[PDB]
Amino acid sequence: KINLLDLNRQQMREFFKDLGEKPFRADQVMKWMYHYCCDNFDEMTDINKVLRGKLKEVAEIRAPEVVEEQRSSDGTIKWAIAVGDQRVETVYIPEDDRATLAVSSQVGCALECKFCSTAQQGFNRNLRVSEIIGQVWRAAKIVGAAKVTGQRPITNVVMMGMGEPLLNLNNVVPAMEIMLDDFGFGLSKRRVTLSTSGVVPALDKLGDMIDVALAISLHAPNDEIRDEIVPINKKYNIETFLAAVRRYLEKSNANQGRVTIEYVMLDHVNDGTEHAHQLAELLKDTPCKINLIPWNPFPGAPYGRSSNSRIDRFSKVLMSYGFTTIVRKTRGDDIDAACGQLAGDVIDRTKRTLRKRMQ
């Protein structure tokens, strides 16, 4: 069967057209899928029985299943999401004004950032469209669909889970189109954020095919430090990445002329005042919002979390130059906040297979 979660509205309309139906019936079906979090054609009351019969025969609504769940005391929910044999993560982060979902793009990652727990695993495969938007669907359902509960479950989506989004453009863009779509999750392009370590050629391509909010993962004042922290800097350095960001903003207006800059705080690597000064000079031409993220530790990594006093000094240096700097609050401290810890080692795959036999 065709999984309807793989399709955007354009593709959803043409599918129904081959079924012998008028375009807006696809829109009507999407609405049941995303506004009500429905995966059952029998539950769709305002669709005629004939159309309902065609859909059950050739189509399915199969969302990724939750294999594990962790609820924090601050509201943060973290899920291990099954995608065939392997596992990926999805984190729900509730706030006062916003509700943010962290979605994964790939199974593992090939970019080997030394401060990321997914790096040590290595890359396995990219996710399908259904496997990316189905994280949102599944999260929305469990949290509570908009037209079921009355309140939207998810107001903000950030592609900051496992994987590098820009190395999966073919599946990530259509999935984001569904997030943006009114018959999908009806999100503003300000509320859909793609994070990237800096795959420059792909970033130039992203701007030609969609307009969403960009956030860059910088983590360094210079190229000498970033070669160590973020290996892709060896291929596309900071000034090549910054120049690519300006080219994107000339096409994009989701950022409103100001790119988001992610900057993790690692003990005595990139958190002294001398790094803040260098970073201020670096970005003097590029308008931005700087998010200072405290490093969530995990076993194995050769780094420590930066003391909050050093984070304040670092922040105040940048604020003196006139940069808008945000110190991001840590979420899920009582649980595994570290990105990629719940979905653990690769060898569990075999141990899961023996589990199902004696179930």
Ligand X SMILES: C[S@@+](CC[C@H](N)C(=O)[O-])C[C@H]1O[C@@H](n2cnc3c(N)ncnc32)[C@H](O)[C@@H]1O
Whether residue 117 contacts residue 162, with contact meaning beta carbons closer than 8 Å, is answered with no
Scanning residues 9 to 48, which ones bind ligand SF4 (CB under 6 A)? none
Rg (CA), the chain: 21
114: nearest Cα among 214, 197, 202, 172: 197
116 binds ligand SF4 (CB under 6 A): yes
262 binds ligand SF4 (CB under 6 A): no
Whether residue 340 contacts residue 122, with contact meaning beta carbons closer than 8 Å, is answered with no
Q: Which is nearer to ligand SF4, 116 or 292 (CB)?
A: 116
Q: Which is nearer to ligand X, 83 or 339 (CB)?
A: 339
Tell me, yes or no, if 116 is annotated catalytic.
no
Whether residue 255 contacts residue 226, with contact meaning beta carbons closer than 8 Å, is answered with no
Q: How far is the CB of 113 from ligand X (least distance, A)?
A: 7
Between CA 24 and CA 218 the distance in angstroms is 43
For residue 158, the SS3 value is strand
Between CA 324 and CA 342 the distance in angstroms is 33
The DSSP result for 165-218, as a single string, is: GGGGHHHHHHHHHHHH-TTTT---TTSEEEEES--HHHHHHHHHH---EEEEE-
Among 39, 89, 164, 271, interactor with ligand SF4 by CB under 6 A: 164
Contact range with ligand SF4 by CB under 6 A, out of 23-31, 54-62, 114-122, 281-289: 114-122
Q: Indicate which of ligand SF4, ligand X, none lies near residue 72 (CB less than 5 to 8 Å, by partner kind).
A: none
100 binds ligand SF4 (CB under 6 A): no
Contact range with ligand SF4 by CB under 6 A, out of 11-19, 38-46, 63-71, 115-123: 115-123
Q: How far is the CB of 305 from ligand X (least distance, A)?
A: 9
Q: How far is the CB of 1 from ligand SF4 (least distance, A)?
A: 32
Q: Indicate which of ligand SF4, ligand X, none lies near residue 119 (CB less than 5 to 8 Å, by partner kind).
A: ligand SF4
Q: What residue ranges bind ligand X (CB under 6 A)?
A: 115-117, 160, 164, 195-197, 217, 262, 264, 293, 295-296, 338-339
Between CA 28 and CA 25 the distance in angstroms is 5
* Residue 274: HSE in the Cβ half-sphere, 13 Å Cα cutoff: 3
109 binds ligand SF4 (CB under 6 A): yes
Q: How many CB atoms lie within 10 A of CB 239?
A: 10
Tell me, yes or no, if 339 is annotated catalytic.
yes
Which residue out of 89, 164, 177, 262 is catalytically annotated? 89
Q: Which is nearer to ligand SF4, 53 or 304 (CB)?
A: 304
Contacts with 23 (C-beta within 8 Å, 6 or more apart), sequence order? 13, 16, 17
Place of tokens 């190229």: 223
Site string for ligand SF4, 308-347 (x = CB under 6 A): ----------------------------------------
Contacts with 182 (C-beta within 8 Å, 6 or more apart), sequence order? none
Q: Indicate which of ligand SF4, ligand X, none lies near residue 160 (CB less than 5 to 8 Å, by partner kind).
A: ligand X
Among 118, 121, 260, 341, interactor with ligand SF4 by CB under 6 A: 118
Q: Indicate which of ligand SF4, ligand X, none lies near residue 296 (CB less than 5 to 8 Å, by partner kind).
A: ligand X
Catalytic residue positions, numbered: 89, 339
